[PDB]
Design a protein around this ligand. Structure first.
Ligand code: AMP
Lengths: 179, 175
């Protein structure tokens, strides 16, 4: 490509009618497969977070499961640790949990009770912002641990699903937007 | 690196009776939470791979889902891309899938080209059923799986014997 953003944008692959007829799926797989594209993606997110919070972030919180692909790498780039917010049942020890809407039904996310001490400043990371269901659940869980969620970031945002407005008061950032 | 390995081992947390009674769960969560520990883990894996394969690796393959935590970072450290092996139904487009004792894994049709050399990564190696199924899927794309690597191996479950002739490497071992 050329610029870093187009190095990422050219690696987001479109699949119409997946998983259901009418929708257009955005596949982030080529970004991970091309090391130059992955590097560019992490760098863009890292520079945004460094410029925005001035190095004053305590942890990245990565979302099960595609957020796991970006969370640790972004954390490492910023010199920060990464905490995990997982689907219900995946984490050992005492947990807090929260429900959210998934397709035609309901699901739950969880976090370990000792994942954070009170007052930690945290950025939530996932690959794609759609309905905002999981990010909303994530913010609720972090709040119960008395964390300060600085913002939610993703590579892709699907604007027609209005995920960003649901996250308020928490600000959202995304590298790329489609419907 | 004894000091680096200690940084990883100190962070591994064990929980008795999870997910079921009698089973000891090895939790790699604190490794991710401590940036120095995460750096150490990625560095140890990368150094092993370079000391064993040099630059003769094309891709890292990360396993859904805990393998996703280490795959990209390890690939990045080696200057390599990362391909995904997911639970069935997650990936768009043409796919190859398979079952194992049931559980199902899947890969995209164009994930790799014939002869390309891959290292598989997951957080923990137990019976080896998961990693073996990943290897078999990759085999159906005519990839050469050089090795499977993980942070932890549970030695008494004989995962490496299941993986053979694909070699397995782990930073830490427990019964
Ligand atoms: N005692 C354990 N502690 C943490 N993860 C485990 C444990 N036993 C099996 N797993 C998970 O099971 C998968 C591999 O198991 P296997 O296919 O039997 O080699 C990986 O996702 C592992 O993290």
């Amino acid at each position: 490509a050329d610029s870093e953003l187009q190095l990422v944008e050219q690696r987001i692959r479109s699949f119409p009618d997946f998983p259901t007829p009418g929708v257009v799926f955005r596949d982030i797989s080529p970004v991970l497969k091309d090391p130059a594209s992955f590097r560019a993606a992490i760098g863009l997110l890292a520079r945004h977070l460094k410029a925005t919070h001035g190095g004053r972030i305590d942890y990245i919180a990565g979302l099960d499961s595609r957020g796991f692909l970006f969370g640790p790498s972004l954390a490492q780039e910023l010199g920060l640790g990464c905490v995990l917010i997982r689907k219900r049942g995946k984490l050992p020890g005492p947990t807090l949990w929260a429900s959210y809407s998934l397709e035609y039904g309901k699901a739950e996310l969880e976090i370990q009770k000792d994942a954070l001490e009170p007052g930690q400043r945290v950025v939530v990371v996932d690959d794609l912002l759609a309905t905002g269901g999981t990010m909303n659940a994530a913010c609720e869980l972090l709040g119960r641990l008395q964390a300060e969620v600085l913002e939610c970031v993703s590579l892709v945002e699907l604007t027609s699903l209005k995920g960003r407005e649901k996250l308020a008061p928490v600000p959202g950032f995304s590298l790329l937007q489609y419907e």
